[PDB]
Amino acid sequence: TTKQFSKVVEDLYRYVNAATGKPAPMISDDVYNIVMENKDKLNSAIVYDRDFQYSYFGFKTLERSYLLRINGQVAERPQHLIMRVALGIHGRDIEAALETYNLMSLKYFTHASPTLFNAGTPKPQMSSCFLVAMKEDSIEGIYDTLKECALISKTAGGIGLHIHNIRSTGSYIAGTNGTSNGLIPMIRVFNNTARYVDQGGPGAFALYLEPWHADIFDFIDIRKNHGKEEIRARDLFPALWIPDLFMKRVEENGTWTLFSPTSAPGLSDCYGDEFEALYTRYEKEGRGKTIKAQKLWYSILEAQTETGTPFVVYKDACNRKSNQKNLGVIKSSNLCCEIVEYSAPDETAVCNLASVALPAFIEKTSTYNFKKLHEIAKVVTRNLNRVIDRNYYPVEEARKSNMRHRPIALGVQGLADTFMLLRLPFDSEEARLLNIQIFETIYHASMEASCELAQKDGPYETFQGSPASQGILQFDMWDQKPYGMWDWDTLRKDIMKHGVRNSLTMAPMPTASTSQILGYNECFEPVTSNMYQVVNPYLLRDLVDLGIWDEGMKQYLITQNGSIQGLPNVPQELKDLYKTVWEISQKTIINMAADRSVYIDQSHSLNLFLRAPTMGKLTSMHFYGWKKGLKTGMYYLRTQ
Amino acid sequence: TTKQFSKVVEDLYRYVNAATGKPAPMISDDVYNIVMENKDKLNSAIVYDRDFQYSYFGFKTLERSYLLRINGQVAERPQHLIMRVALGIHGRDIEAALETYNLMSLKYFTHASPTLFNAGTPKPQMSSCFLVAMKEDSIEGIYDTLKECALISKTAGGIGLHIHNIRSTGSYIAGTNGTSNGLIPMIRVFNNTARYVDQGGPGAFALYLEPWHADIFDFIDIRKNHGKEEIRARDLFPALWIPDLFMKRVEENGTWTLFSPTSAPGLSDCYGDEFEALYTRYEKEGRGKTIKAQKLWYSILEAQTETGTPFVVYKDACNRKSNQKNLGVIKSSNLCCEIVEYSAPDETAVCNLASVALPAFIEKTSTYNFKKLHEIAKVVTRNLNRVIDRNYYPVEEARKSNMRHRPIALGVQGLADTFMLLRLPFDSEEARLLNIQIFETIYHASMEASCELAQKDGPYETFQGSPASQGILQFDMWDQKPYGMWDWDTLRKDIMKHGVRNSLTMAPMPTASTSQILGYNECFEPVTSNMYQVVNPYLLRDLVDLGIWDEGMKQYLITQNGSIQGLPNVPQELKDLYKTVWEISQKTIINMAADRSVYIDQSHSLNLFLRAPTMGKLTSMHFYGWKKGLKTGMYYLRTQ
Ligand SMILES: Nc1nc2c(ncn2[C@H]2C[C@H](O)[C@@H](COP(=O)(O)OP(=O)(O)OP(=O)(O)O)O2)c(=O)[nH]1
Ligand SMILES: Nc1nc2c(ncn2[C@H]2C[C@H](O)[C@@H](COP(=O)(O)OP(=O)(O)OP(=O)(O)O)O2)c(=O)[nH]1
Ligand SMILES: Nc1ncnc2c1ncn2[C@@H]1O[C@H](COP(=O)(O)OP(=O)(O)O)[C@@H](O)[C@H]1CCO
Ligand SMILES: Nc1ncnc2c1ncn2[C@@H]1O[C@H](COP(=O)(O)OP(=O)(O)O)[C@@H](O)[C@H]1CCO
Ligand SMILES: [Mg+2]
Ligand SMILES: [Mg+2]
C-alpha cells in the first residue's frame, strides 16, 4: 500500500476498469477536491501507528471487505478508510472531519458497514435500513414494490417489508373473476428477486405480518427445512407484528379470528383500543375464520424452535411509545428488529447507524467516564445527521421519508466487555445500574445534540405535534422517571422551545461485523462463549494471574462449550464474571432490556438464548417481555 | 340452461359473487343495452339446432372452458356464446352482428380463444399475442418490463419477449463497481413471474435472442430436463432470432463471435448487410469471444432433439419482407412464431386472430368455392379490425402500438381435412396447387377488405412510406408473381391510391384449441395420426365403403401409431391419401410452407416432424427452409 493519504485518494479517484477501459473513480468529485485543497493538513493528521489498535480477525475483517481495492489488491490502509469516511461524512468542515478521524482511529465509536463501505465515494449509500410499505393490493402495487426492493437491494442495506394489505388465499379477484393464491406465491416472487439482485453483482428481507392475516400459518413456516418447497421462501425472514389482543387471547385460552384484509379493512392502520374495537366488531360480523388462539400460538413456537423465526415485535408497544406517532400508524420494524419508523407507499423509512465502543470510557480500581461518553455520543449524533444530508438515496420514497423526519440510530457495542473489565457479573446489581446509566447518558447526549442542531438549522419538518414537542420523552411514554444522572428538565425545556433536528435517535443494532473490527463483543448481549480457537482476553489474564492456566485447563474450554462453570479449580468470582449467555437467566436478559428500553426511542435487536427449550419455557419468555412492555420481544431464537 | 338469449344475457349481467356479496356482471354495460334494445330480433335469429354442428370432444371443449359459467354451472349454450361474441365484436351494427353469428354458427370461421372467452364482457381482452421489448439494460427497465409482463399475463394472451439488450455474464456494472450474473438469473425472475401470475387467479412466454449473445449456450438449454436447475427456466420457451450471417458461417464451417451487447452495441437494431458490416467490424475490433460456428450449431440441435426448442425464426427474412419495415427493426416474433411485428420500449405489438374453416368451402365430383372463401375472408378481416377498436388493452404500450399500425392475423384450419375431402394426397401436385390458391385468395380478400376500410375510415397512421404504399405487396418482397386467380393489379392500384386500414393481415397460427371446437385438424399441418380412441372420419368412411373395415383391421391402427401404410388389404389410393405427418417428407412440408409464405404478411407456426432424428437430417431441414426464405424456419421439433 502507498502510505500518503493524498496519493491513495489520487489512485482511487483516477481508477480505470482495465477490462473495459471505463473510468471508474472510487472517490467522489467532492471529497477528492477537499483532500487536494487540504492535503498537508490531512496527510499529517493521520497517525499510522493506530492500525495496531486492531487484531488478527479485526484487521482481516477490514482487509477482506471494507478497505477499497484496486484490481483485487487492497489500496486502503485502515487510517485511510477512517479519514475517507470522516471526510465523506463532514465534507468541507475539516475540523469536524479531523475530530471524527481522531475518535474513530482511537476506537471510541464507529459507523455501520454501509458508511464504512461507501462514505466518500461517488454514490455514497451510507444507510443500513429500509422499511418498505407494500404499495397496494394489486398486481401493479406488488410489482412496483418488488421493483423498489430490487433498486434498494442493488446498493446494500436491508429491507423490512410489511405485507398485511395483500388479500389472502382464496379471495375473489373481480377483474378476472378468479381467486387469489395468497401470500405464499407472492413471497416466492420476492425471494427470487432477493436472490437475483446481489448488492450490485444477495438480498435479505424481513417480511412483517399481523397474525390475524389468513395465510399466517404458512407465513410463519417459510424458513422450515422440510417438506413442500413451493410453500417455502428460505431467503426471507418472517417477522410477526403482534397486537396485544393476540397475546391476551392466547393467555385467556380464547379464540382468534383470521381475516383477509379485503374482508376486514383497516386493521393494520390502527392500534391499541381502536384496533381492539374494530377487530372485535369484524369478529362479530362473521367476516373471518375463528380458531383457537393457542393453536396459532403453538405453531409459532414450533417454527421458532426449528428455525429461530418468526421474529416477534409488539405492534402496540411500538406505536404507543413512538415519537413518530403523529405521522400515522407504524406497520413494521426492519431486518434486525431495532428500527421502528413510519412507512407508507410514498415514504420508505431509512436509518443511519453507528455504535459507541463502551469499553473506551473505562478509566487499582476502575471507573466509567460517563462525561466522556456523553461527549462522544453528541459527536456521533452530529455525524449521523450529516449522513442524512450527504446520503445517496436509492429510491425517491427513501429521500422523502428521511428528509422529512430525519431519524437516526445510535447504538453500542462491548457492553459485556465493559462489565468484565469492571468485574461486574452480567446479572449483578452493579451491572444493572451501569446498564441504566449508560443508556440514560447516550439518550440525553443524543437529544441535547439534536436540540443544538434544531437551534441551528430548525427542527425536523414534522416535529410539531410530536410527543417531544409536548415534552414527552421516551421514558415518559413508559410512565417512568429517569435515573437522573443527567438534568432532564432543562433538556426538555429547551426541546419544547427549540425543537429537535431528529425524530428519533437510538436503536441499538446487532453490530454483527463492526464489533469484530473493533475487537469487542456484539452490541449489548453477554458473551456466547469464552472461547471462539482463541479465549476471552479477560478470562485469559485472570487464569494466568491465578497460576491455574495450564493445558489441562485450556482443554475444559475447548471441550466444554467455552464455559468455566463446574470447572474444579477456578474461583467462584471468575465463574460469576464469565457466565455465558446460555448460563444467564433470560428473565435477567429481559429485565435489563426493559431497563434500557426506557431510553431507546426505536427498539433493540434482542436475541433470545434457550438451552433446553420447551414450549412452556418459550411461552414464559414471550409473555415476560410482552408484559415488560418490550417493543422487540424477540429477534432470533438461538437454541440447543 | 335457460333457452332465451336475452334471459341468459340478463342472468349474466345481474350476476353477484355470493361468497363476497359483490356484483360481478359478466356482460358489458354496452352489449347488455344492445341486447335489451333489440331482444326480439336477436332472440329469434338464433337457430338452436346448430349446437349439433359440434362433436363429443368439440362440445366438451366449449363447455369445459369457453361457455360462461354461473356458480360453476354452464350458463351459456354455444349459440349464446356465438351471439355474445358477434355483438361484442360489432356492437350497434346489428346487421353485421347477425351475419357474423350466422357464419360462425354454421362453422365457416371462428375467432381465437381470448375473443371467444372475453368478447361482450366488461374488460374484453380479445387479443391473443403480445410482443414485448425489454425496456432497458438496467434494474429499472428489467423490473418495469417484468411488471408489464405480469399485467399482460393477468388477462390471457401469450408473450414473446426479446432480451438481446441485456448485458451478459461477467459484464461490468459501473454503479456498484460489480459484475453482472447475466441472462440466466434474469430469465429465472421472469419464470417465477409467469408461475405466480395465472391468468387472473400460468404464463407462457417465449424469449427471443440473437445467437451472438454471449450467454447463448445456456439460453438454448433452459428447458433441458437434466442437471443444474438454477441454470434452467422450464416454464419458458427460448426462441432464436437468427441472422443469415450465422447460417452462412455454419455452412462455411467458419467462426462465430459472441458479444455482450455493451461491448458490441446496436446489433439487434440492424439487419442484413448493415448488420453484417457492423458485426464484422466488431469482430475485427476484438470486442468479443470467437468460437467455431459449428460448435454453437451442434448445441442448438442437441437442445432441439431433447426439448423441441429453441424455436428458429430468421431475423433478416422477417425484416426484409415486412410491411412494417418503415417502423424500425423487428426484434422478435411471439409465443407461437407467427406474428412478426415491430416492438419497442413504448410499443408492445398486439395481434387479434381468427381462422377460416377451410372445409366449409367444399361443394359425384367435389370442387372448392374460392369465391365463397374470398367473401368469408373479407367478413373475418372486418371483424378483426373492429376487435382492434373494441379491445381492452392490459397495458398502454399495447394500445399505442395497435392503434397506430392496426395489424391483424387471419389464418386457417382444416387444410388436411380439405385435401382428404377432395381426395388429394398431401404431397400431390393437386394439393400443392390448392395450397397456393387458398392462400392467394385469403390474402387478396384481406387486402381488398382492408382497402375498403381505408377508403371509409382512413389508412392506418403509419401507412405512408410502407412497402404497400409503394405497391410492394408480400409476394413482391419474395420476388415472385402471384398465381393470379385474383386481379392483383387493380387491388394494388386501389391500395396505392387509398391505402389500407391494417399494416398486416395474415399469420396462420396453431389453432390448437379452436380446430378442436370446430372438429377439424389444426391449421395447415397434415394429420399426425388417423386415430386419436377414435379414427379419422374420412378414413372410416372409406374402409367401410371397401368392406375391409373389421376388428382385425381396427387393431392395426391402435397398435400401429394410427398409420395405414404397410397394411396388407388397403388400396394404395387410401395409403397415399392418409399419410401421417411422420410419413410425409419435410422437404414437401417446407416446400408448401414456402409456396404459401408469399401470401403471408407475418409468418406461420411451422412445426417440424422428424421420425428418426440425426444431427445431419436436422441440419438439412433448417438449411432447406432457411434457403427457401422462410421466416419461421421452425416452431417445435416433434420427434420419435
Ligand atoms: N444480478 C445482478 N445484476 C445486476 C445488479 N445490478 C445491476 N445488474 C445488471 C442489470 C443490468 O443488466 C445491468 C445494469 O444495471 P443498472 O443499470 O441498474 O446498473 P448501473 O446503472 O448502476 O451501472 P451501469 O452504469 O449501467 O453500468 O447490470 C445486481 O445487483 N445483481
Ligand atoms: N396469483 C395471482 N394473483 C393475482 C392475479 N391477479 C390478481 N392477483 C392478486 C394480486 C392482488 O393481491 C389481488 C388484486 O389484484 P388486482 O388489483 O391487480 O386485480 P383486479 O383489480 O383486476 O381485481 P380487484 O378489483 O382488485 O378485485 O389479486 C393473478 O393473475 N394471479
Ligand atoms: N444481509 C444483509 N443485507 C442487507 N442489510 C443488512 C443485512 N444484515 C443486516 N443488515 C442491516 O444492517 C443493520 C445493522 O446490522 P448490524 O449487524 O449492526 O450491521 P454492521 O455491524 O455490519 O454495521 C440492520 O439494521 C439491517 C437493516 C434493517 O432493515
Ligand atoms: N399458454 C398460453 N398462454 C398465453 N397465450 C398463449 C398460450 N398458448 C398460445 N397463446 C397465444 O395464442 C395465439 C394463437 O395460438 P392458437 O393455438 O391458435 O390459439 P387458440 O386456438 O386457442 O385461439 C398465439 O399467437 C399465442 C400468443 C403469441 O404471443
Ligand atoms: Mg384491484
Ligand atoms: Mg445503467
Report the SS3 class of residue A21.
coil
Q: Does the annotation place A401 within a ligand binding site?
A: no
A334 classed as catalytic: yes
Helix (H) or strand (E) holding B411: strand B409-413
Cell of A564: 468455566
Q: Quote the DSSP letter at residue A464.
A: T
Strands B409-413 and B172-173, bridge-based pairing: unpaired
Residues contacting residue B410 through CB under 8 Å, at least 6 positions apart: B353, B354, B355, B356, B377, B380, B381, B384, B442, B446, B505, B506, B507, B508
Q: Residue B513, annotated ligand binder?
A: yes
Which three cell numbers, joined as nine digits, stand for B135? 425496456
Rg from Cα positions in chain A:
25
> Which of A186, A213, A188, A226 lies closest to A268, judged by CA?
A213
The three-class DSSP label of residue A497 is: helix
For helices A94-105 and A370-390, the axis angle rounded to 10 degrees is 130
- The backbone torsions φ and ψ at residue A356, rounded to the nearest 5 degrees and listed phi first, read -75, 130
Decide if A139 and B151 are in contact by the 8 Å CB cutoff: yes
A171: how many CB neighbours lie within 10 A of its CB?
Answer: 21
Helices (H), B252-395: 272-284, 293-307, 315-320, 370-390
Q: Decide: B158 and B117 in contact? Cβ < 8 Å.
A: no
Contact A135, A164 (CB under 8 A): no
Distance of CA A167 from the midpoint of ligand 2 (Å)? 9
In angstroms, the CA A318 to CA A332 distance is: 9
The whole-angstrom distance between A542's CA and the closest CA on chain B is 47
Instruction: Provide the pairing of β-strand B311-314 with B236-242.
Output: parallel
Residues in Cβ contact with B10 at an 8 Å cutoff, skipping those fewer than 6 apart: none
Please choose, from the candidates A56, A51, A142, A126, the residue with its C-alpha nearest in 3D space to the C-alpha of residue A91.
A126
Q: Confirm if A413 and A511 have CB atoms less than 8 A apart.
A: yes
CB-CB under 8 Å, B155 with A139: no
Cβ pair A360, A106 in contact under 8 A? yes
Number of H helices, E strands in chain A: 26, 20
The alpha-helical segments, DSSP class H, found in A266-353 are 272-284, 293-307, 315-320
Distance B178 CA to ligand 1 centre (A): 8
Enclosing H/E stretch for A30? helix A29-37
Q: Which of B595, B590, B599 is nearest to B632 (CA)?
A: B590
**What atom of ligand 4 comes closest to residue B409's alpha carbon?**
25
3-state secondary structure of A508: coil
CA distance B452 to B378: 10
Q: Distances in Å between the alpha carbon of B237 and those of A203, B204, B218, B512, B636?
A: 28, 8, 13, 17, 10
The Cα-based distances of A363 to A54, A429, B373 in angstroms read 20, 21, 101
- Residue A210: CB atoms within 10 A of its CB come to 22
What are the phi and psi torsion angles at A573 (to 5°)? -65, -35
Terminal Cα distance for chain A, rounded: 45
Tell me the sheet residues that pair with A409.
A353
Cβ neighbour number for residue B326 with a 10 Å cutoff: 18
Q: Are the CB atoms for B603 and B339 separated by under 8 Å?
A: yes
Q: Please name each of the domains of chain B with its CATH number.
A: 1-640 (3.20.70.20)
With 0-12 CB in 10 A as exposed, 13-18 as middle and 19+ as buried, what is B306? middle
Contact between A178 and B192 using a beta-carbon 8 Å cutoff = no
User: Which of A13, A151, A153, A177 would best serve as a mutation to test chain B binding (most B beta carbons within 10 A)?
Assistant: A177
Choose the catalytic residue: A323, A326, A334, A607.
A334
Q: Which three cell numbers stand for residue B358?
A: 377451410
Read off the DSSP letter of residue B431: H
Main-chain phi, psi angles of A35, to 5 degrees: -60, -45
Could you tell me which of B637, B625, B639 has the C-alpha nearest to residue B242? B625
C-alpha closest to that of A496 among A477, A475, A473, A478: A473
- B249 close to B255: Cβ distance less than 8 angstroms: yes
B-chain residues near A175 (CB < 8 A): 123, 154-155, 200
Secondary structure class of B633 (helix, strand, coil) = strand
Cis peptide before A310 (omega within 30 of 0): yes
> Residue A226 in 3-state DSSP?
coil
User: SS3 string of B169-234?
Assistant: CCCEECCCCEECCCHHHHHHHHHHHHHHCCCCCCCCEEEEECCCECCHHHHCCCCCCCCCCCCCCC
Whether residue B149 contacts residue B132, with contact meaning beta carbons closer than 8 Å, is answered with yes
Residue nearest to atom 3 of ligand 4 (CA): B158
Ligand nearest to the CA of A177: 2
Q: To one decimal place, what's the resolution in Å?
A: 2.1
Give the minimum alpha-carbon distance from A489 to chain B in angstroms, rounded to a whole number: 47
**Cell 391494417 found at:** B502
- Count CB atoms within 10 A of the CB of residue B401: 25
Whole-angstrom distance, CA of residue A139 vs CA of residue B96: 37
**Pairing status of strand A73-74 against strand B632-634:** unpaired
Q: Which of B336, B341, B511, B602 to mutate to test the pocket of ligand 4 (most atoms within 8 A of CB)?
A: B336
Catalytic (active-site) positions of B: 334, 336, 338
* Nearest ligand to the C-alpha atom of residue A176: 2
Q: Determine the Cα–Cα distance for residues B46 and B4; give it in Å rounded to an integer.
A: 9
CA dihedral B433, B436, B439, B444 (to 10 degrees): -110
Q: What is the DSSP letter of A499?
A: -
Which of B335, B375, B405, B331 has its CA nearest to residue B113?
Answer: B335
Phi-psi group of A242: left, alpha or beta (phi > 0 → left; psi -120 to 50 → alpha; rest → beta)? beta
Whether residue B75 contacts residue B312, with contact meaning beta carbons closer than 8 Å, is answered with no
Question: Could you give the angle at which helices A78-90 and A94-105 cross, rounded to 10 degrees?
Answer: 140
Longest dimension (CA), chain B: 80
Neighbouring C-beta atoms of residue B566, cutoff 10 Å: 9
In this structure, what C-alpha cell is assigned to residue A332? Answer: 413494521
Give the three-state DSSP class for B333: coil
Confirm if B35 and B7 have CB atoms less than 8 A apart: no
Q: From the CB of B134, is ligand 4 less than 6 Å away?
A: no
In 3D space, the residue among A329, A335, A515, A264 whose CA is nearest the CA of residue A411 turns out to be A515
Bridge partners for B207 per DSSP: B161, B238
Say whether A191 is catalytic: no
DSSP A549-568: -SHHHHHHHHTTTT--TT-T
Could you say which of B139, B181, B195 has the minimum Cβ distance to residue A150? B139
CB neighbours of B625 closer than 8 A, spacing ≥ 6?
A: B590, B593, B594, B606, B633, B634
Where do we find the cell 420457451?
B237
Q: A466 C-alpha vs ligand 2 centroid, how far in Å?
A: 38
User: At residue A247, what is the residue type?
Assistant: M
User: Distance of CA A424 to CAs A428, A433, B104, Å?
Assistant: 6, 11, 91
In whole angstroms, give the CA distance from residue A350 to residue A393: 9
CA of B511 to the centre of ligand 4 (A): 8
Across the A:B interface, residue pairs with CB atoms under 8 Å apart total: 110
Give residue B521's identity as a one-letter amino acid code.
N
The three-state secondary structure class of A573 is helix
Distance CA A373, CA A504 (A): 19
Q: Is A366 annotated as a binding residue?
A: no
Residue A608: is it exposed, middle or buried by C-beta count within 10 angstroms (0-12/13-18/19+)?
Answer: buried
**Radius of gyration from C-alpha coordinates of chain B:** 25
Ligand 1 in contact with A197 (CB < 6 A)?
A: yes
Distance of CA A32 to the CA centre of its chain: 32
Contact B389, B139 (CB under 8 A): no
Grid coordinates in use for B582? 411422420
Question: In a 3-state reduction of DSSP, which class is residue A312?
Answer: strand
The grid coordinates listed for A520 are 469487542
Q: Which residue of B has its CA nearest to A71?
A: B177
From start to end of A547-635, where are the E strands? 608-609, 632-634
Q: Do the bridges between strand B409-413 and strand B353-357 make them parallel or antiparallel, or are there none, so unpaired?
A: parallel
Nearest CA in chain A to B169: A201
* Spatial distance between the Cα atoms of B574 and B362, rounded to a whole number of angstroms: 20
Is A317 annotated as contributing to ligand binding? no
Residue B49, SS3? helix
CA dihedral angle for residue B469, residue B473, residue B476, residue B482, rounded to 10 degrees: -140
Is the CB of A355 within 6 Å of ligand 3? no
Question: In this structure, what C-alpha cell is assigned to residue B280?
Answer: 464484422
Residue type, A512: A
> Which residue precedes each gap in chain B (C to N above 2.5 Å)?
201, 363, 532
Distance CA B316, CA B299 (A): 22
Q: Where are the alpha helices (DSSP H) in B486-633?
A: 488-498, 514-518, 537-545, 551-558, 572-577, 586-597, 615-628
Nearest-angstrom CA–CA distance, A76 and A119: 14
| Interfacial residues of A (vs B; Cβ cutoff 8 Å) | 17, 19-20, 22, 24, 26, 123, 139-140, 142-144, 146-147, 150-151, 154-155, 172-181, 185-186, 188-189, 192-193, 195-201, 263
| C-alpha span between A384 and A96 (Å, rounded) | 13
